[PDB]
Design an enzyme around this catalytic site. Sequence first.
Site, PDB file in Angstrom:
ATOM      1  N   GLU A   1       0.802  -1.219   0.000  1.00  0.00           N
ATOM      2  CA  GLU A   1       0.000   0.000   0.000  1.00  0.00           C
ATOM      3  C   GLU A   1       0.841   1.279   0.000  1.00  0.00           C
ATOM      4  OE1 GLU A   1      -3.251   0.112   2.693  1.00  0.00           O
ATOM      5  OE2 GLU A   1      -4.249  -1.579   1.668  1.00  0.00           O
TER       6      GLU A   1
ATOM      7  N   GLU B   1      -6.087  -8.450  -0.250  1.00  0.00           N
ATOM      8  CA  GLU B   1      -6.751  -8.072   0.987  1.00  0.00           C
ATOM      9  C   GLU B   1      -8.217  -7.786   0.708  1.00  0.00           C
ATOM     10  OE1 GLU B   1      -5.049  -5.241   3.771  1.00  0.00           O
ATOM     11  OE2 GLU B   1      -3.017  -5.790   3.072  1.00  0.00           O
TER      12      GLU B   1
END
Lengths: 590, 590
Positions: free
Chosen positions: A403, A497
Amino acid sequence: TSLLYPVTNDQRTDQKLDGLWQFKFDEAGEGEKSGWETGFHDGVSMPVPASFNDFFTDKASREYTGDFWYSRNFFVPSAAKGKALFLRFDAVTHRATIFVNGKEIRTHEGGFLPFAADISEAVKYGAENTVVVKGNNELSREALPAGDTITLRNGKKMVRPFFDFYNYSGLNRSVHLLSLPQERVLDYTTTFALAGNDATVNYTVETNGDAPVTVSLADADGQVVATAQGKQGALQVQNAHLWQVRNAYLYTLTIQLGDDTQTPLDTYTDRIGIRTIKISGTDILVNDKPIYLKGFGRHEDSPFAGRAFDLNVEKKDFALMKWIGANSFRTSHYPYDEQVYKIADEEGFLLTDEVPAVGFKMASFFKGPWLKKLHERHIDQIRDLIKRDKNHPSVLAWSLFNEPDTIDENAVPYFKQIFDESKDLDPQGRPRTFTLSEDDTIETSKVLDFPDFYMLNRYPGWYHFGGYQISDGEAGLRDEMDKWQKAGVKKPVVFTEFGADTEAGLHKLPSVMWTEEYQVEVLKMFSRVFDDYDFIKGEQVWNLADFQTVEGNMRVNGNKKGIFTRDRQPKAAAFFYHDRWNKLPLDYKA
Amino acid sequence: TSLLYPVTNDQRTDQKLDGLWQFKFDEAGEGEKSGWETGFHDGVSMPVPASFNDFFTDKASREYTGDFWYSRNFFVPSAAKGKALFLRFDAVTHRATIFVNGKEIRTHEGGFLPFAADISEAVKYGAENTVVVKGNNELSREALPAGDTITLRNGKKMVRPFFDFYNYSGLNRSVHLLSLPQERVLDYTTTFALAGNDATVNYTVETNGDAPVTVSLADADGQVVATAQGKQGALQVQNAHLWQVRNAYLYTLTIQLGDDTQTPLDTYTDRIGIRTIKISGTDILVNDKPIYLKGFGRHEDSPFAGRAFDLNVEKKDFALMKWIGANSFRTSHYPYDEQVYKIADEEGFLLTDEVPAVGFKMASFFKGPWLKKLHERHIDQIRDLIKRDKNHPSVLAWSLFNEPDTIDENAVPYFKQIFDESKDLDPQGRPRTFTLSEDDTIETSKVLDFPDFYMLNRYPGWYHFGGYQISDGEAGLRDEMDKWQKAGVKKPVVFTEFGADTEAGLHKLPSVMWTEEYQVEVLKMFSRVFDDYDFIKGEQVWNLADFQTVEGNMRVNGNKKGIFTRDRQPKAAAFFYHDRWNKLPLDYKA
């Protein structure tokens, strides 16, 4: 200089210094001026390996940020005089200075990869010696993982990370006392080819001398099937037993130094699997057949050890992942203990190996004077990771960020550089990738050319369109999936995710967010979406087990998105995947 | 026109229509074109009173937003021909149209105050008749409580409130069939004075005729202690038994219409308490002595009835509040069933009566074309509330907003107007106030001149400076308390929200947010602060019991800031206040 895992044979010894060390906090930074580097016994006993945080009843200790000290006595055998002596630290989170008998030997940056100290001339052979470790666990934007350290109005230092997991610190992995030969193996590499029922291991061997090298491969019953001489060579394995997903077969590699006449100078042995990995357009090929990834979503987190490696939890996590039908997992968000990969090798799991390049974004980041030192440490930890885990059959791909803030056009120089400086590190040339956060999408991401396949983090039904809105969140996800399909996506897509916090025991009909039913509802939704698109080649749900986290009003005693509880019992969503994943073949979508 | 609570005597009847009505959703808005106003029996049975939401297993029903219909048959006795006949609806959330025998009688706006329909000419005396209610539960910025209604991508309507509690809707309170005299009492007022051991009730009586009026007061054993004639008058009570906090004494008031010669035309009886309320600078005076408020923090919320009044939960909530040492609570965020105040009167609690002026702020608000109609409905619901609850000894103060956005200078015209149009409504002239949110502080609030005493909502240690930061949050709260003290605060200050979500069963040492220990730690902190400042005259913690809420990732199946669980068992924080509050005298800080 060498990150080979310790082995025991007639040329190499390896003895753990695990157990109870002495421990002291150094909030003032006076430890060295106070003579603590010579060792001490006026502190508190602390297990090794283990995070120190959870052994204290006061929050001030649990949250302590700064300089902390470990001290231990150990015995150096007389018989070891003349070998290369090493203290090998498997992980010291996050910074270490090593002292032996009060003498400073070495420092280290990074809290999740091993380092070794040569103590050959700092010990008294045949007596007790002292080892002292000065650790620090502060965060900053110049170190992985990224964060800030603040001072409260009362003077105390406190960490505020740019990531989710808790700042578990200290001697998180074993400490070895090694005895190595003066001329020894330092590194080796393996790559594979297949041809009919035959295969070819292509090796190389790094050494710190000129003595001859001799490599031999034996099968699982101990029979030798290939020999070769020289620091480069190719072993021909007739009728090879390939390493298969959830179906491993491991050959034993033996490297030996010295010519046919002298006493052997060094022996090193490892276990490898003969298998290949290719990204063919939109397929992931293991041994030239297409696979479909199913799994997690993991952390190294347990109630009593914290971040520290615990073999009981690891074999239990593996027992569960086989039970559930999974075949993969991503070592979010940092390299794991080396035992995790050896079990993965024996169980035929596919791992995505992740460097602790997490938190490269704020709630911008690539527009700061910290990148220069950050990048030093980033590409160095990339180098150490690939050097350590190269030879595992079970490592499928490398993950270089989790991320990062790829929306800003300034991320693009830094990615350019990271991706050029890692281009030729893995001899097998496995795919390099990273995870795209919810904000980084086909529309908005500026680094979509770099990865070898796409890893997507999406949270419809949790951080967006929660509750009764879930249907609009499903529609938005298909929106984005339509735009990928439009853009003619040629690389594979893997969801890495997704999910929902779930308090085991919360039930409602109809559901509400945080109940066991809602989690199943959310996971069913994501499944419906994944099954309507062919470029989607994998689902890795977040998370395998509830793990610990910084305190916050959204953290009900840590993260709760886990399919299993922090004690490793199932929530209702365990049985949904147990049903689904044990019905999807390994070649789903082909 | 009259909001007196129904009574039973020889002039007035009162029969509940509670039980199982018929129920149908009308997502299309075709109910009236379909002839449903004439009654129906092809739907689902639904209890009255009760919110309809939690009786459905599908989320689409639970979340339904739009037009819904209740239908019932009832019997009108022959004996009732000639009286004023009424359907009295105690609460229809939020909008109602009333039909009797298919004939539209009346509408109503606002879902928490009672209204009556005169059905004297719409029934067949001596047979069965039909009552149908067309309810709506949409939200908008023109109605209290404030919110928005959205349409999902799939057509379905969904509410998104500007407040925390769930949108429980339907027939949330009893339905009465009344028989009243043609000339009757409509309203009355009481105010009190004290002098030595003597007191003076000052009354007035509103009537819809000219017949003579006769008022008499009797003590708790039924002895008459004062009579008077006329629509205004003063009853002299010698050696009065005052109504005391947690020590009530209630006299019975009896209003009677008609001269000494005719048959009585109307009787109305109520129970009042002789006590006075004055704000003397920074003290709250009940009967001229200073008090200290301790309590909650409440909602009308129970597992099976939802928003609807349930006498079992109410007596249980009262059993607990006495056990714990409390003496007050605020009817957040809407008027409660009228039974709540009668129990408060019998138990000597002090109530802050709140109108549903919640959600007047967004995450600006006073800068929109919705205020004009919003204000119509706001000051009307203020008028109805004060008219309904005037005479209760236990109502201490009126609350006219909860957490309005007072930072914008445009709130100031609207407050000016609300506060002028309510100036002379309560005959006792009790203090009018409102709650200031975390953002509205001594530094930033623009309406600090208006309230008669200050009600503060502060969440250090939860929405700000959570976890290990709590100490900086305590310091900031004392910062603000220092600036109030500097500004020479002359009105009283009462903390009316503070606390911490707590999952009963979550334990940690040291604590983390969401555990039972952290809650106690937070409540101890607030206590330390409250005790170092003299203008602070009350602590009302949020909340008394876990209550239901909109779905969200921060809502672990509803709000959890409650001292007690939604089933009304104690968390550890119950026993902290049980210790503390039963040791603070009623005159703490004087």
